[PDB]
Structure 1
Amino acid sequence: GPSGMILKRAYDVTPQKISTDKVRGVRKRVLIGLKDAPNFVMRLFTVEPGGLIDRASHPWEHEIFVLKGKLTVLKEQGEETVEEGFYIFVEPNEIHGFRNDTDSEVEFLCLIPKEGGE
């Protein structure tokens, strides 16, 4: 493929609104997307206060790193909150979701294999 390196301020990517049956109060920046990625993509999610990524599962994993705030993680059984500096691994097909129960924006990096989209 192509050569070179991209170095860019993540906030120079505009946050795009995500609105689906199971997602509300969320915006996403695609940092390293399908157009460039050999294998996996990098997104930066912003969860607004009260925003919800409701429980779901899908045939690919997540690798997540929490950048800002207190994130509530929804599990098959119950929930647990983590904060900036936590990582999360979600195996393929594992039930998961996220909620922001705080009054300030939560941000996390979320990487998936590119077969799962961007």
Structure 2
Amino acid sequence: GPSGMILKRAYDVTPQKISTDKVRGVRKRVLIGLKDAPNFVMRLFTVEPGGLCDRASHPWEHEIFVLKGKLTVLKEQGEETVEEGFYIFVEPNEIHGFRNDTDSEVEFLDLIPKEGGE
């Protein structure tokens, strides 16, 4: 594939609204997307106050790192709170979701294998 290196301010990407049956109040920046990624993609999610990614599962993993704020993680059985500086590994097919129960935006990095899209 191509050579080189990209160095870019993540906020130079405009956060795009995500709106699905399960997702409301969330925006996403694609940092390293399908047009460039050899194996896996890097996105930066912003969860607005009250925003929700309701419980779901899918046949690929997540690797997440929380950049800003206090995030509620929805699990099969209950919920748990994380904050800036936490990482999360979600196994393939594990039930998960996210909610922002605070007044300010939450941001996290989210990487998935590229077979799961961007």
Shift of residue 96, structure 1, vs aligned partner: 0.1
Structure 2: distance between partners of 1:8 and 1:72: 29
Structure 1: distance between partners of 2:34 and 2:76: 30
Runs of 5+ unmatched residues, structure 2: none
Structure 2: distance between partners of 1:51 and 1:81: 15
Partner SS for 1:11: helix
Structure 1: distance between partners of 2:44 and 2:17: 12
- C-alpha RMSD of matched pairs (Å): 0.1
Partner SS for 1:115: helix
Structure 2: distance between partners of 1:77 and 1:92: 17
Structure 2: distance between partners of 1:81 and 1:27: 20
Shift of residue 68, structure 1, vs aligned partner: 0.1
Partner SS for 1:3: coil
Shift of residue 9, structure 1, vs aligned partner: 0.1
Per-residue CA deviations over 1:57-111 (Å, capped at 9, x if unaligned) read 0000000000000000000000000000000000000000000000000000000
Runs of 5+ unmatched residues, structure 1: none
Shift of residue 53, structure 1, vs aligned partner: 0.3
Per-residue CA deviations over 1:16-45 (Å, capped at 9, x if unaligned) read 000000000000000000000000000000
Structure 2: distance between partners of 1:13 and 1:105: 17
Structure 2: distance between partners of 1:55 and 1:5: 36
Partner SS for 2:11: helix
Identity %: 98
Structure 1: distance between partners of 2:52 and 2:17: 13
Shift of residue 3, structure 1, vs aligned partner: 0.1
Shift of residue 52, structure 1, vs aligned partner: 0.1
TM (normalized to structure 1)? 1.00
